[PDB]
Amino acid sequence: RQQLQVLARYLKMDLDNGERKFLKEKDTVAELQAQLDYLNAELGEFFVNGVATSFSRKKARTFDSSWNWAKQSLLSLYFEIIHGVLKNVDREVVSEAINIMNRSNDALIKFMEYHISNTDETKGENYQLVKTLGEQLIENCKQVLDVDPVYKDVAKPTGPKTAIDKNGNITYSEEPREKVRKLSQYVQEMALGGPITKEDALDKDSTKEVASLPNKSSKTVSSTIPRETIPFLHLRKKTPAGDWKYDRQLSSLFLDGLEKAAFNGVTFKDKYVLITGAGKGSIGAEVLQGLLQGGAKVVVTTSRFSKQVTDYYQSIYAKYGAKGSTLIVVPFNQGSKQDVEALIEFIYDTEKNGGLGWDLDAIIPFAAIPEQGIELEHIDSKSEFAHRIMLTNILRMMGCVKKQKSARGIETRPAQVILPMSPNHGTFGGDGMYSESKLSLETLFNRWHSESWANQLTVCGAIIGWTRGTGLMSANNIIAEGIEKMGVRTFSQKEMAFNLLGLLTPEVVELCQKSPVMADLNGGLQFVPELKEFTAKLRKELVETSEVRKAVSIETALEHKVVNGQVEIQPRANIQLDFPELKPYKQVKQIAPAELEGLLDLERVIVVTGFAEVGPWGSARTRWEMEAFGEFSLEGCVEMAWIMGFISYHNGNLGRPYTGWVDSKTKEPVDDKDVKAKYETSILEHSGIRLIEPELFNGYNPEKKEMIQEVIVEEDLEPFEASKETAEQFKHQHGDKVDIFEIPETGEYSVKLLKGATLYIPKALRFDRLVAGQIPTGWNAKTYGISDDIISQVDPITLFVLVSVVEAFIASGITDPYEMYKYVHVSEVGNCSGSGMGGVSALRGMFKDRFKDEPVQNDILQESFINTMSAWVNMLLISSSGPIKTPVGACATSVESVDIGVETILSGKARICIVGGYDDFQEEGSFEFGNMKATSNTLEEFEHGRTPAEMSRPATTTRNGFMEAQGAGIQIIMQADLALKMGVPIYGIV
C-alpha cells in the first residue's frame, strides 16, 4: 500500500477525488429530496400525482370516414331486417334511418338502389318488409341529398321505477313514461310545468315513421304555458338588483327552439366544439352523439386513453357521425395546467405546424371527479385537486381560448361556454369542494361585462337538474320515483343532453352573444323544501322496508324448516368438426342452373375437401371464432386451453376415480364451465399479435440484440490454457501474433495473444421492432403426438407443417392417409405446397452457430431446404410417389401453390394434392425487414398510443408497416369426381 501511495504521488493522481465528488452529490440529492418532501407535505400525494401530464399531439385520433360507415350501417340494417332481428314496430329502424339520411350522397343512393332493387320479395315476409323499407329510405335520402344533417332523437322517453320484492329485493328500472312517448310531448310537459311551480306511427309502423322523417312539420308551445307558472325548463334574466329571475319571453324562445328541434331536428354543421368529461355513461357522451349527428367538428378529451376507449369512440362515430362531421379523441388531464395550454395550442395551431387549425365555436367543460363523504374537516389534497379541475383550470382554458383568438385578431367569432352549474350549493354536504367550485363558476356572468374577453367568449350557464344514470348522480336512482311523486321532474341523460343541445341552437347562440344566459334545467326541484331531509327520508324508508322484509322472510323460512324438518346441468364442451351442411336435393337443385346437370366434366372441377392451420390464434376453428365473433365459445376456450397446455386430460385415480380435464401444472380437476374463468385472461394475453417472447425464439430479445466488434489488441493478453488442437488452431489463425507453449506437466498448451492481434467483443443493440404475431405460448408438437426424435431432428417450421397437414386431412374426414390408396395409385397424390424462406433456423445454425463453433447437427443443411417440409410430410404420413413441386413465391407462395396444384390435377399427374404455405419468424428476418422499413416501427406506434392489438390496421389512414407473424396453412384439393366417390366433405370450388 505504501509503494502504491508513492507511485500515485509520483503520478500526481488523487485517489479520493471520486469519493469527494460522490459525497458532494449525495448532499445535493438530500437537498433536492427535502424540497420534494416539503412540496408533497404541502400539496398531498393525490394532488401531486394528479397534476401529471397526459396530453400529446401524436396520440390524437381522427375519425372522419362517414362515407364508408354509411354503407356499413345500411348493410347491417338491411340484413337485420332480413333475419328478423329488427321489425317494423322498433324505434331502432327510425333512428338508423335518421343516421343513414344524415350521411346521404350519390354513391350511398346507388348502393341502396342496387341492394333494394335486387331484393326478391317473394322469398319471405322479411324480404318484402326490407324492400318496402328500403324504397322509402331511398326516397328520403334523395329528398335530403342536399340538406344539412340534423340531430333528431326518437328514443322512447323513460321514467324511474323502483320495486321491492317479497324478500326485500330492491330493483330499479327505467320504464316507458305513460303520458310522454315522444320528445315533442316531453317539451309539452316541460312547458306546462306543475302545481308545485305555480308562483305518429312509432311502435306500430317504422316504415310509415321513416316516410315522415324528411317532412319539416301552428301554435308554439310557449303559448300553452299557463300564466303564473314556472316551466320545468326556463331561462332567467338578471334584474337591476342583480338577482336572476324567471323570464317568460326568454323561456318561450328556449322552449320554442326545443319544440322545433323535437319536430325537425337541429343542425350543427360548421360548429367546432371542444368537450371534456364526455366518457361512456355520462351526460357529455349523449351531448357528443347529438353533436356528431348534427354534423359538428368535435374534439373530445379522455382521462383514460386506451384501446377500449378509442374503440368506443370509433363505434360512436361510425353510428352517428353525419356527413361533414369529424371526431378527434385526445388524451387529457384537466387537472394539469400544462395539458390545458397544450390542448388549446394543438387545437389552434396550423396543420403544417402539427395542429388542427380550428377556431372553437363552443366549449363544454364537463370534466369532474367525485368527492364522497368529505365534510369540512376532511377537505384535503383530493378536494384541492378536484377544485383545481372544476374551477381553476376551466378558467385557465377560457383564458387560453381568449388569448388564442386575440393573438389572431378574431373579434367576431366568439366561443360559447356551456358552464355545468348546480342548483345546490352546500345542501347535501359531504362533497368536498364541489359546491365551492360550482358556486364560483357563477362569477363569470358578471366578469363578462367587467372585463375584456366578451368578444371572444360568451357565457351560457346551465343549471343541470336531477339526472339519473352515471357520473355523480348515480346511486340516487332508487329515490327518483319518490322525488317525482311531488310533481318534480327527474331527467334521463338523453333528456338532459337534449336540453343542453337546446342551448346550441342559432337563436340561443345569438342571445348569448347579446348577454350572458342562465338556463334553469332543474325540473322544478328547487321548490321542494328541505331537500336533504326529504331525500334522506325517502331512502331510509326504502332501506327499512327492504331489510325488514328480508329478515322476516329468513326467520319464517327457518321456522318452517325446523317445524317440518332442483338439479341443474352445467355445459361440457363438445367440439365439432363443422363439415359443410348438406341440404335436400330439391333445394340444392334450385340454386344452380338446370342446364348444369351433365354439362360439366367433374374430373376437371377442383374442390377443397379439407383445410387447417397453425397460427397466432391456434387452429382454424379458434382463429375463425376470434375473427368472426371476437370471443371464444366454451369449445373454443377449451380447445385453446388444450393447445396452450393449460389443461390436460386425466382418466383414473385422482383417491376417487376421475375422468376429465385437470390443470397441467397442479393436476387439479377442472370443469369445462370453469375453464373460461381460470384461463381465458392468460389465453388472450398469450395469443395473437403480442410483445415478442424470447422463450419462443431461442432467447431472442429484440431490446438487446447481440453483435460483435473487431478490435486490435493494444497489449499482450494473459495466457489461457487450451488443448493442443485448439492451440494449433489459434496459431494457424494468428501466426506471429500469438504464442503457444506446451505445459510440460499437463500436456496442455498456454495461448498468449500478443499486441496487434484481432479479437471480437460482444456488443448489444436495441432494435425497434418488438411485436409479432406468435403461435400461442404453450404450443407443443408433443400435444399433437409428434415424437421427441422428430422434434429434435427437424426445423420448427416442419412441426407447424406436419400438424397442419394432419389437421387438414382430419378436416377432410381422412383419418388414415393410406385410405387414399384405395381409390388412387400411389403416383397420384401430389404435394405442391411451399414457403418463402424455409427453415431459417437451420440457416442460422449453419451460418452463425457453426461460425461460433457451437454444437450443430451434421445434417443441418438438409433441414433448411424449402422442399424439406414436403419431404418430411411424405416420409412420415403420406408415403406417396406422386408429383412434388415446391413453389417459392415470397408472400404469394400459398396462391402460387394453389395454382400449381390445380394445374397438376388438371394435367393428370395427380388426383389429390396438398397445397398451402408456411414460414417462420426469427431474429435475422425481423431485422432485415426492419432495415427495409417494410414492418412497423413499434416505438413510433407507442408514441401514438397504439397497443400491439391495434398495430395491424390495413386500409387505415395511419397504417405504417406490416406486422410479422408465423405459422402454416394447408388445404387438400382433389377432383370433384373423386371427392364425391370418396364421400369427403367439400368446402368450396377452386
Binding site: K71, Y114, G598, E613, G615, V895, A955, V984
Partner: protein, 145 residues
C-alpha cells in the same frame, strides 16, 4: 393497400360490375399479422369459412378508412362482422416480393351438386355422414390422448 384496392376496383369496372354493388373487403391480417408465405393459405381458409357460414368478418382495427380509398367505388371496407344471407364466391389476392401477384376464386360448394343426379347426391350425402361420424370419433380420441 392502395395498389390492391386500385387493382380490385379496375377488375370490377372493366368487367361491368354493377354500380352500387361494391365488393366487401376482408382483411384478416389485422388479427393474425403477416406470415411471409402462409398468408394466402390463411386467407383461403377464411374464405372457405365465409363461404360456408355466410358471415363476413369485420376489420376491427379499421378505425378510419383512408380518404384516398373513397375513389374506389367498387370496394367497401367494413369494421364489424356482417351476417349475410349467403356468399356465393370469394376472391383471394396476394402480392409477394419479386413481382409475385396471384389471385384465386372460390365458389360456394352447393353449386357443384347441381351437376349431378339425385341418386348420386344422396349416395354422397350418406357417405359423408358416415365419414363425419368416424372423423369425430378419431378427432376426440386423438385430442384427449
Amino acid at each position: 393497400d392502395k395498389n390492391e384496392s386500385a387493382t380490385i376496383n379496375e377488375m370490377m369496372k372493366h368487367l361491368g360490375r354493377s354500380e352500387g354493388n361494391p365488393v366487401i373487403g376482408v382483411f384478416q391480417k389485422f388479427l393474425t399479422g403477416h406470415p411471409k408465405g402462409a398468408a394466402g393459405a390463411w386467407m383461403m381458409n377464411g374464405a372457405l369459412q365465409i363461404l360456408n357460414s355466410g358471415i363476413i368478418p369485420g376489420n376491427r382495427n379499421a378505425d378510419n378508412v383512408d380518404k384516398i380509398l373513397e375513389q374506389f367505388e367498387y370496394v367497401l371496407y367494413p369494421s364489424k362482422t356482417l351476417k349475410t344471407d349467403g356468399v356465393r364466391a370469394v376472391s383471394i389476392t396476394s402480392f409477394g416480393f419479386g413481382q409475385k401477384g396471384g389471385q384465386a376464386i372460390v365458389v360456394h360448394p352447393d353449386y357443384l351438386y347441381g351437376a349431378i343426379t339425385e341418386d348420386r347426391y344422396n349416395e354422397y350425402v350418406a357417405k359423408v355422414s358416415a365419414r363425419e361420424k368416424s372423423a369425430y370419433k378419431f378427432f376426440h380420441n386423438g385430442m384427449i390422448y
